[PDB]
Amino acid sequence: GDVEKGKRIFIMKCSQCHTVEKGGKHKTGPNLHGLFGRKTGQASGFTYTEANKNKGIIWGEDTLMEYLENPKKYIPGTKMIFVGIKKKEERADLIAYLKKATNE
Ligand code: HEC
Ligand SMILES: [Cl-]
Ligand SMILES: [Cl-]
Numbered sequence: 001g002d003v004e005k006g007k008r009i010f011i012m013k014c015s016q017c018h019t020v021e022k023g024g025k026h027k028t029g030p031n032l033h034g035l036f037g038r039k040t041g042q043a044s045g046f047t048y049t050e051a052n053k054n055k056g057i058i059w060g061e062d063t064l065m066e067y068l069e070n071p072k073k074y075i076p077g078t079k080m081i082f083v084g085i086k087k088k089e090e091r092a093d094l095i096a097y098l099k100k101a102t103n104e
Pocket of ligand 3 (some may be wrong): 036059
């Protein structure tokens with residue numbers, strides 16, 4: 001995906017509730033640093049729903065592609081009230097940005 005396009009998508013659609021940098025603050029949603037390769041519900045210091053803790057998947061490109069299309073379909077009962085991104089290329093670009101930004 002296109003990291004530069006994905007950053008803009010993140011800012012427009014996600015930054016209201018999320019940070020990505022190491023040591024970044026929790027907002028309505030958790031800081032996302034270290035997301036890839038981690039089970040759901042594991043950001044340090046954030047209180048998740050039981051639903052997000054129970055999901056028991058590992059975040060990576062494929063599981064994010066699915067989640068971000070329709071969050072409540074993937075994790076029923078989640079407190080992330082976000083409609084989703086319908087277009088696959090936009091999800092891919094966002095996820096490429098996340099893969100970079102949450103790993104530095
Ligand atoms: C507020 C209105 C949000 C917006 C907009 C987005 N997210 Fe979110 N997210 C939010 C909350 C409250 C939570 C916790 C959910 C719970 O049920 O406890 C989350 C969670 C995520 C997760 C899962 C994190 C984990 O399991 O550690 C991810 C991967 C995530 N959010 C990503 C994300 C992205 C990329 C967004 C823009 C497209 C986005 N969220 C919007 C709140 C909100
Ligand atoms: Cl709960
Ligand atoms: Cl991956």
